[PDB]
Structures are given as structure tokens and as C-alpha cells.
Amino acid sequence: CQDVVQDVPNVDVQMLELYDRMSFKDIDGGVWKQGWNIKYDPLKYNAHHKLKVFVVPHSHNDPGWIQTFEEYYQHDTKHILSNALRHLHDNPEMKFIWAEISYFARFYHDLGENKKLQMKSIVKNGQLEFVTGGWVMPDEANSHWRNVLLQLTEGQTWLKQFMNVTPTASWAIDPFGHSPTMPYILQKSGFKNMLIQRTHYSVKKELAQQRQLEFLWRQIWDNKGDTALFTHMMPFYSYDIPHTCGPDPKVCCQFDFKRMGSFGLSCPWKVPPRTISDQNVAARSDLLVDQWKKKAELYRTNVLLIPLGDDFRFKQNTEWDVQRVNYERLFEHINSQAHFNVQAQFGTLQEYFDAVHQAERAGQAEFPTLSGDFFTYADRSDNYWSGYYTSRPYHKRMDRVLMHYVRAAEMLSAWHSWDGMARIEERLEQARRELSLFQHHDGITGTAKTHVVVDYEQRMQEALKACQMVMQQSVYRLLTKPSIYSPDFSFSYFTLDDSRWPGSGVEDSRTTIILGEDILPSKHVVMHNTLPHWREQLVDFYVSSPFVSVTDLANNPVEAQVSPVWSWHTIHPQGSTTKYRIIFKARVPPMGLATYVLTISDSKPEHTSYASNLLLRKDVKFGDPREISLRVGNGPTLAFSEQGLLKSIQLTQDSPHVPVHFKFLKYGVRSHGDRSGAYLFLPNGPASPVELPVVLVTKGKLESSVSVGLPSVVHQTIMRGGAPEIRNLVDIGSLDNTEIVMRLETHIDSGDIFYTDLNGLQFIKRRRLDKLPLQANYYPIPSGMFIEDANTRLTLLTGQPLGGSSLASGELEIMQDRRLASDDERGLGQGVLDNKPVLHIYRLVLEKVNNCVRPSELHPAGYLTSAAHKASQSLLDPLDKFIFAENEWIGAQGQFGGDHPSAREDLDVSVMRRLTKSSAKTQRVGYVLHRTNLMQCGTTQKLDVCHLLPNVARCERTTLTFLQNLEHLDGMVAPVCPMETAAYVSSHS
Numbered sequence: 001c002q003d004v005v006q007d008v009p010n011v012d013v014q015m016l017e018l019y020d021r022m023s024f025k026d027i028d029g030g031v032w033k034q035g036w037n038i039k040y041d042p043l044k045y046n047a048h049h050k051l052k053v054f055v056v057p058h059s060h061n062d063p064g065w066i067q068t069f070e071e072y073y074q075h076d077t078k079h080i081l082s083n084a085l086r087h088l089h090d091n092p093e094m095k096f097i098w099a100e101i102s103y104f105a106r107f108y109h110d111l112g113e114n115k116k117l118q119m120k121s122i123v124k125n126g127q128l129e130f131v132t133g134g135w136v137m138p139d140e141a142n143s144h145w146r147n148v149l150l151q152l153t154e155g156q157t158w159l160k161q162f163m164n165v166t167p168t169a170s171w172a173i174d175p176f177g178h179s180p181t182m183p184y185i186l187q188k189s190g191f192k193n194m195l196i197q198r199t200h201y202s203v204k205k206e207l208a209q210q211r212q213l214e215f216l217w218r219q220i221w222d223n224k225g226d227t228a229l230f231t232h233m234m235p236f237y238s239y240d241i242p243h244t245c246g247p248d249p250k251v252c253c254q255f256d257f258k259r260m261g262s263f264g265l266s267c268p269w270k271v272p273p274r275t276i277s278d279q280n281v282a283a284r285s286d287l288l289v290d291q292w293k294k295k296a297e298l299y300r301t302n303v304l305l306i307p308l309g310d311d312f313r314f315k316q317n318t319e320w321d322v323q324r325v326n327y328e329r330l331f332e333h334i335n336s337q338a339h340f341n342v343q344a345q346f347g348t349l350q351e352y353f354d355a356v357h358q359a360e361r362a363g364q365a366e367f368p369t370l371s372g373d374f375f376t377y378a379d380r381s382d383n384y385w386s387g388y389y390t391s392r393p394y395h396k397r398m399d400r401v402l403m404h405y406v407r408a409a410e411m412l413s414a415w416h417s418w419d420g421m422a423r424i425e426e427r428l429e430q431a432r433r434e435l436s437l438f439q440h441h442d443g444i445t446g447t448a449k450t451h452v453v454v455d456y457e458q459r460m461q462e463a464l465k466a467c468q469m470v471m472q473q474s475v476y477r478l479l480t481k482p483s484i485y486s487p488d489f490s491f492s493y494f495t496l497d498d499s500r501w502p503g504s505g506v507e508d509s510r511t512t513i514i515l516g517e518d519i520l521p522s523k524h525v526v527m528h529n530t531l532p533h534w535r536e537q538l539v540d541f542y543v544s545s546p547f548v549s550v551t552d553l554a555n556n557p558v559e560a561q562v563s564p565v566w567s568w569h570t571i572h573p574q575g576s577t578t579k580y581r582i583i584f585k586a587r588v589p590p591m592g593l594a595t596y597v598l599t600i601s602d603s604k605p606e607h608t609s610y611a612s613n614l615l616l617r618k619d620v621k622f623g624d625p626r627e628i629s630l631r632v633g634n635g636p637t638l639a640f641s642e643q644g645l646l647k648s649i650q651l652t653q654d655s656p657h658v659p660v661h662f663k664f665l666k667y668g669v670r671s672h673g674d675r676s677g678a679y680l681f682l683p684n685g686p687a688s689p690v691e692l693p694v695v696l697v698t699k700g701k702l703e704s705s706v707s708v709g710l711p712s713v714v715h716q717t718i719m720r721g722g723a724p725e726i727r728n729l730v731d732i733g734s735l736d737n738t739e740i741v742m743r744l745e746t747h748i749d750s751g752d753i754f755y756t757d758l759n760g761l762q763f764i765k766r767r768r769l770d771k772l773p774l775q776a777n778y779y780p781i782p783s784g785m786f787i788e789d790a791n792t793r794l795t796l797l798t799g800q801p802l803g804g805s806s807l808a809s810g811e812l813e814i815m816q817d818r819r820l821a822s823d824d825e826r827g828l829g830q831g832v833l834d835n836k837p838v839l840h841i842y843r844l845v846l847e848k849v850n851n852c853v854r855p856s857e858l859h860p861a862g863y864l865t866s867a868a869h870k871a872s873q874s875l876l877d878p879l880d881k882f883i884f885a886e887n888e889w890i891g892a893q894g895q896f897g898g899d900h901p902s903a904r905e906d907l908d909v910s911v912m913r914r915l916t917k918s919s920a921k922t923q924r925v926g927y928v929l930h931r932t933n934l935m936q937c938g939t940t941q942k943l944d945v946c947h948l949l950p951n952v953a954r955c956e957r958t959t960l961t962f963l964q965n966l967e968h969l970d971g972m973v974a975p976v977c978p979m980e981t982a983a984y985v986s987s988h989s
């Protein structure tokens with residue numbers, strides 16, 4: 001395996017180094033406003049060296065944005081695809097690319113058979129070419145890598161099953177900045193090429209000047225270069241026709257033939273397109289070819305890509321007519337006139353990349369290598385798109401909850417083949433597709449209209465219910481003796497109990513276990529652990545009585561703690577007399593289940609302790625405000641201010657109290673300048689302190705917490721014996737033009753360096769740049785962020801993607817919510833005034849790192865410790881909890897998976913998914929194995945997934961989508977290196 005710590009890759013362009021060297025000066029470049037007046041040598045082209053031009057018609061279809069998925073499908077997309085089918089069938093030399101398989105699948109299944117066969121004919125002959133073939137064109141900032149793979153898999157599985165094609169070229173023209181997680185996944189899924197568009201105007205200018213817009217994009221840690229994927233960055237401001245023919249939009253607009261006649265579109269540069277005729281074709285051709293040759297100067301080959309399309313284009317048959325026939329007139333003229341030294345035709349994306357490859361094999365070009373990312377994007381001046389890292393944070397949090405529920409439901413149900421009457425496959429397909437849809441660059445991003453966000457939320461709620469039904473059926477089957485198991489697939493054997501979604505302060509919907517000395521003294525509960533190692537985790541349930549004790553199914557006592565149930569309502573807490581929280585440590589096998597029993601008694605049982613409660617304000621105890629110190633277990637000691645906010649952490653009895661201060665601050669909106677909206681973050685200066693309360697302290701043997709009711713945030717620090725958990729109930733209410741930030745202040749001498757993650761996959765080094773505005777120094781925090789000096793690190797792990805930074809040495813900060821009264825002129829046509837209360841969850845890990853092997857200061861990556869990685873796993877993939885619904889469970893087993901191997905801590909079974917229905921004579925199960933890289937600080941069984949299930953006939957290493965066999969495995973054993981992701985399919989008789 002490559003060493004990803006001591007060894008630093010050699011790349012031509014390393015993006016952290018580029019940003020340090022770039023001035024980012026917003027100079028007027030002329031007609032190419034953000035570039036320069038391109039010149040070419042007309043003698044470059046001659047009879048011996050021609051320019052080969054591919055005009056690639058396309059239509060950007062958003063799966064929800066201003067309208068819902070179903071609204072756009074009925075009003076726009078079904079007409080685009082019906083016209084594409086008719087026009088490509090009738091016109092064999094016309095071409096069209098299609099990216100969004102969500103829409104293509106919705107359309108194709110509604111076709112009559114004649115039209116399905118006509119559609120297969122234009123795919124088979126290459127006229128209609130799928131690009132990427134994901135369910136959507138996902139966001140790349142907020143999206144988890146697992147959900148990027150899920151939606152890619154959903155689309156590509158659909159294309160393999162129904163069209164027998166697998167795209168190897170990716171098309172991502174609209175996500176708001178770009179992540180190297182995409183080439184990472186694509187290159188492990190058989191891709192050869194990808195295209196991106198929305199990168200910072202300054203980065204486009206800098207790369208254009210060096211002809212570095214085409215590059216072999218490798219991961220920041222990849223010394224060898226085996227992760228590299230050929231990437232094409234488009235050079236101009238937009239993917240629309242005015243910004244895709246060449247550098248002058250006033251000219252390119254005259255070759256968007258929809259912007260004349262009856263269509264109701266026009267050129268804002270005030271020169272209309274004109275119909276191509278014998279009278280004007282020579283002049284129109286010279287104007288267009290001059291644009292193409294200028295654009296060609298930015299690239300290394302004689303093969304040129306000219307996208308032809310825009311949002312929901314090709315909707316009318318007349319639009320197909322005017323674009324096709326006018327371009328045909330131009331091509332017929334250009335190709336017949338030797339003086340241009342051009343061959344021009346309609347083509348596809350793969351056609352372009354194949355031609356570029358051929359030019360490279362011919363010796364025309366050597367491409368540069370690149371690592372890093374393209375965040376944070378700005379399309380003009382200081383308009384950085386760091387707002388959508390936080391917009392609609394309720395749905396951002398919901399994404400991570402549904403991520404986990406899909407994984408758990410697929411895994412729990414994979415262990416068996418299910419009768420079709422159980423409808424396991426239908427519910428898992430529904431859950432996968434609703435989650436996949438939400439990866440769209442107007443879903444998770446929080447950049448859709450309010451009714452479209454409600455449609456995404458309703459879809460995800462239906463997906464969560466679908467996962468609940470599969471999980472509970474699966475648990476009942478796994479833990480009931482087969483001699484007894486006689487299922488009713490409409491029956492609820494278990495109810496799920498989720499402590500963190502939506503959160504009792506957001507939705508008071510947790511089931512209270514009703515116990516009673518008469519009629520029901522005991523209740524069975526069951527924990528699931530989706531991770532492939534033994535896990536101990538505190539769990540809690542609501543119980544109707546405080547007199548409750550816990551056992552396993554062998555009736556061994558389990559130490560427990562009863563806490564009161566508190567709610568927040570000046571802001572003050574109130575205690576429940578209707579319910580109590582029973583808290584105990586669950587021990588669960590790898591990818592397994594464990595059963596416990598809750599039993600009532602008439603008085604305090606032997607093995608249950610009772611938390612004390614102290615209410616501080618300027619039996620429950622009362623007190624004036626004061627600094628407090630707490631320690632749970634062998635865990636750290638935390639000190640809190642008089643306002644209930646952390647002020648210091650003491651890791652061990654013999655270590656110092658290290659200052660770590662939590663603060664809540666607010667950003668505002670500019671009175672005179674551009675206004676923040678769903679996309680843009682345009683703060684009116686540095687954040688100002690929130691004006692501050694009642695402090696609730698609950699002290700227990702197993703769990704303690706400090707909660708404070710602040711304006712807009714109920715802030716809670718929970719201690720269970722290691723890194724604390726932070727929970728913020730965030731209610732921005734009617735605070736128009738406000739963004740609430742949570743900030744950490746320390747003495748860690750981090751200077752201008754900090755680390756944030758990409759897609760939950762990798763940590764990337766960031767440098768704060770005082771030459772850029774505040775909003776440019778905000779990056780996505782999809783799962784964590786850290787700062788460190790020579791001795792000390794602080795890591796904040798998140799249960800939801802938010803925006804954040806380090807705006808000074810020793811600080812971290814992360815945005816909680818934002819309420820914007822104004823539109824930011826990117827097409828949404830509304831601000832963000834539909835906030836609702838959201839429960840955000842974090843872990844806070846202070847560590848000594850002076851005995852850790854860290855990368856050299858030139859390495860562009862950072863790595864978590866064991867502690868911080870487990871903390872993140874605790875947030876994203878907690879134990880699942882099941883309450884048995886009926887009074888008696890005959891044939892109950894105490895455990896499932898006690899024989900499963902407990903894999904090394906850096907290895908995860910990200911995906912387990914049965915790929916075949918019960919009717920298949922050969923059953924197949926797919927696994928995705930991810931190995932992270934953890935820092936070695938001087939602090940298990942081999943996992944062979946092909947042997948997890950019996951009667952294995954075959955073990956294959958596959959692409960991550962499971963669609964191609966890469967390697968038949970010896971002895972049917974599944975081997976993976978640090979920072980590598982591998983997929984395996986096991987086949988069974």
C-alpha cells in the first residue's frame with residue numbers, strides 16, 4: 001500500500017499552492033469580462049492541422065428547483081424526452097446527451113412498447129448518449145460520499161438493467177464548486193473522463209493562461225497517481241449557449257437559434273440571432289469559427305468541445321428544428337470551405353473525449369496533473385457561494401438520518417432472501433430513490449422554492465418509514481427461532497426509537513414504554529450495530545415509571561441511570577411527571593443485534609442510579625449562577641461558565657485545564673451592497689456576540705449534561721465518559737437577515753491553517769487568506785473540521801453538513817441557520833424565510849498529538865485520530881433501537897452476529913446490499929468496504945465479506961456500483977489499502 005502520511009504527491013497544480021500564489025484580482029478582461037482578449041495565429045490551422053469541433057446538444061433538467069420533480073416532469077421534461085426520441089429517430093446525424101436518470105426512468109416506464117424500442121435504437125446507435133448516468137447531478141459540497149455513490153449506483157443500475165449501457169464520461173455543469181470525491185468514486189466505477197463548470201472565475205483565468213483546463217485529477221494523498229481521472233473544466237461564466245461558443249457572449253448569443261422568432265427569448269447584448277442563409281452563411285461562419293478558434297487557444301489539442309444547450313432546452317419540436325437546421329447550414333458551409341481548416345459536426349461527450357485521447361496518443365499534448373478541490377466558488381466579484389453550505393439545515397440534517405436508515409435497512413434485510421409478498425425490495429427501492437433525489441444540487445443545497453423543499457421532506461419522510469418497516473421485519477426474523485418465525489409482513493413487531501431525529505425538542509414523538517406491575521411489567525428492546533466491530537454505546541428509552549431496571553435476556557443485571565425528561569419553553573426548562581429516561585450501555589456484535597429487558601418495580605431497584613438536577617438562574621436543587629465542573633466516568637473533566645457554555649477541558653487527572661470556549665454570534669446582511677440569499681454569504685462585517693439564562697445541570701453516574709436556553713438556541717453539552725456530545729436546538733424564529741454561528745476559541749497556535757472534510761471521505765488542508773473576503777474563507781463542513789499546533793488538536797465532528805471556517809488562530813466556527821429576507825439573483829426568486837427548529841448534533845474532541853506521526857507541512861491532507869473517527873461514526877451510524885410491540889416474544893434470541901469478525905477500526909462495511917430477488921437461483925450480495933487512514937499515535941479479526949453468508953459459489957471484486965467484475969478472487973476471500981474503497985459481490989447457491 002502507498003504511504004499517505006510521509007510521502008507527498010508531485011502534481012503540476014496543487015490547489016492550496018495555487019490559491020496562495022493567485023492575486024484573485026477582479027480585472028475587466030473585455031468581452032470575456034473575467035479573462036482577456038484571446039489571440040490566435042491564423043497559420044496554426046492549415047490543410048495539415050485542422051480544428052475538429054464537436055457541438056454537443058444538451059438540456060439541463062433540475063430534479064426539483066422552482067417546481068417539484070413531478071411538476072417539471074409533467075410540464076417540461078416529458079416533452080423534452082418525447083421530442084428528443086422523435087427528432088433523433090428522424091435525423092440520424094443529430095446527437096443529444098442526457099444526465100438525470102431519475103427523469104429518464106420516470107419517462108421510459110410510461111412509454112408504450114413501440115416508443116421504448118425506438119428509444120433503444122437511438123441509444124444503441126449512439127445518437128442519445130447518457131452522461132454520468134446518476135439518478136441526479138449531485139451537489140458536491142454537502143453530499144456524503146456514500147450518498148454520491150448511492151445515487152450514481154441507482155442511475156447506472158437502471159441504465160444497465162433497462163438500456164444495457166454504462167457511461168464512462170461524467171457531465172457536472174451546475175454544482176456550486178467541485179469536489180475531488182467525484183473523480184475518486186467515478187474512477188473506481190469504470191469512468192475514463194469527467195467535465196466540470198462552476199469554478200471560481202479567477203481559477204478559470206489562471207488555468208486558462210497555462211492551458212491547464214484539462215488535467216489528470218488525482219486525490220491529494222495519491223503519490224502513485226492510480227486515482228487520476230481526466231477532467232475537462234469549461235472556461236467561461238456559464239454552460240448556456242452565450243458562454244459556450246467562445247469568449248464573446250454578444251457573438252455566441254447570435255448562435256442560440258431559440259433567441260429569435262416566436263420563442264419569447266432574446267440576447268441581452270442586443271444583437272439577435274439570424275437565420276442562416278446562402279446570403280449570410282459565409283459571414284455568420286467566419287464570426288462563429290473565430291469564436292471557436294479563440295476558445296481552442298485555451299486547450300492543448302485540435303479537438304474542441306462546444307456544448308449547445310441550457311435549462312430545460314429542446315422542449316418544443318420547433319426548437320429542435322431551428323437549432324439543427326441552422327447549425328447544419330453552418331457545418332455544410334464550414335466543412336466545404338478549405339480556408340477555415342475546420343471539420344464541425346454534432347457529437348456527444350464521449351465522442352469529444354475519445355477524439356482528445358486520440359490526439360494525446362498522436363503526440364499532440366501532454367496533460368498536467370492536479371490535486372485539491374474547487375471550493376469556495378464565486379461566479380463574479382465577491383459573490384462567494386458559501387451560503388448554501390448552511391441553507392435549510394433541517395433538511396441537511398434529515399439527509400444524514402436517512403443515509404443511516406437506508407444503510408441499516410439494506411444491511412438488516414440482506415441477511416436473508418425475502419418472499420416478494422414482504423415488499424422489501426419495493427420499500428428499499430423507494431428509500432434509495434428519495435435519498436438519491438435529495439442529492440440534487442437544489443435538494444441538500446437548500447436552494448429550492450419552499451413547496452419543493454416540502455416535496456423533498458415528504459419524500460424523505462416516506463423513505464424513513466419504508467426503512468423502519470424493513471428494519472423491524474428484519475430484526476424480528478434475525479432474533480426469532482426459525483421453528484417459530486411465522487411472519488405477517490403488514491405487522492409492526494417493533495417500533496423504532498430515535499433520540500436524535502427529529503429530536504424531542506423539535507418533535508415530541510418518542511414512544512413512552514408503558515410498564516405496570518399488572519398487565520405489562522417488562523419490555524424487550526433490541527439494539528442494531530451496522531459497523532463491523534463490537535460496539536458499546538449508552539442508549540436511552542422513555543419509560544412510564546422511574547422504577548426500572550435493565551437485564552440481558554439471560555437476566556444478567558445491567559447498570560442503568562434514570563434521568564428526568566426536560567423540555568424548554570425568557571427561556572426555561574420543565575420536568576415531565578409522565579415519563580423518565582432509562583440509560584444503559586448496550587454491547588452489540590459487529591453488524592449485529594443485542595436484546596435487553598426493561599422491568600418495572602414498586603421501588604428503586606439495586607442496579608439503577610438516579611441523576612441529580614440543579615437549576616441555576618439569577619428533589620431538584622436551585623442556585624444562583626456559578627461556574628461548574630463535571631466529569632463522567634474515566635472521561636475528560638469539563639468546566640462551564642456562569643451562562644452554561646464550555647470554558648475548559650482537562651483530558652486526564654494529570655493534564656492541565658485547556659481553555660476551550662463555546663460562543664454564539666450573529667452575522668447580518670449588507671444595507672447597500674449585494675444581499676445574502678440561499679446561495680451567497682455576503683456578511684456586513686465580522687460576527688457580533690448573541691445577547692444572552694437558565695442553566696440546567698443533570699449529574700449522573702452514566703450521563704451528565706449542561707443545558708442553557710439562549711435566544712434562538714437551546715445549547716446542550718452531554719458527557720458519557722469520552723468526547724462530549726453537543727446538541728443545539730436552533731430556532732432562528734423571525735430574526736430576518738441573521739445567520740447564527742457557533743464559535744470555539746482556544747490558545748491552539750494554528751495560525752492560518754485549518755482542516756475541513758470533503759463529502760465525509762477525506763480531510764483537506766485550508767489556509768485562511770486575508771486577501772480574500774470573510775465569505776471566501778468559509779468551506780463546506782460536511783462531517784468535520786479541526787485545528788492543531790505542535791502539541792494540541794481540536795476536532796469538531798458534525799451530524800449534518802454546515803458552513804464553517806477558522807477566521808483566527810485557535811478558532812473554529814460553524815453556521816447553525818440563516819434567515820435571509822432578500823433574493824440573491826441566482827434564479828430562486830425568494831430569500832430564505834421558511835426556517836424551522838432543527839436539532840444539530842456534534843462531538844468535540846480535544847487531543848494531544850505531539851506523539852502522533854503527522855504528515856509533513858507540505859502535505860495537502862489531514863487525518864483523523866482513532867478517537868475523532870469513532871466520534872464521527874457515533875454521530876453518523878449510531879446504534880439503532882427497537883421496542884418490541886406485543887406483550888410476549890416466544891422464541892426470542894439474545895444476540896445475532898456474535899460470530900461476525902470484529903474488523904480493524906479503520907475499516908467499514910459502508911454498504912451491504914442483496915442484489916437479487918428471491919426468484920434468482922444464484923443469490924448475489926454486494927459489499928462496499930472503505931478503509932480510512934488514521935493518525936498513528938502509539939495507542940481484531942480479518943473480515944472476509946464473501947464468507948459472511950453461507951454456500952458461497954463465487955467472490956468477485958467489482959466497480960463500486962457492482963456492475964462490472966474486475967477480479968475473480970482466489971479461495972473466494974475478499975482482501976484494502978488506507979484511503980481505498982473496494983466493492984465485492986458474493987454469489988450463493
Ligand SMILES: CCCCCNC(=O)[C@H]1N[C@H](CO)[C@H](O)[C@@H]1O
Nearest residue numbers: 062065174311442447825826827
Ligand atoms: C439567474 C436566473 C437563470 C437561472 C439559470 N439556471 C441556473 O442558474 C441553474 N443553477 C440553479 C441553481 O439553483 C439551478 O439548478 C439551475 O439549473
Ligand SMILES: [Zn+2]
Nearest residue numbers: 060062174441
Ligand atoms: Zn441545475
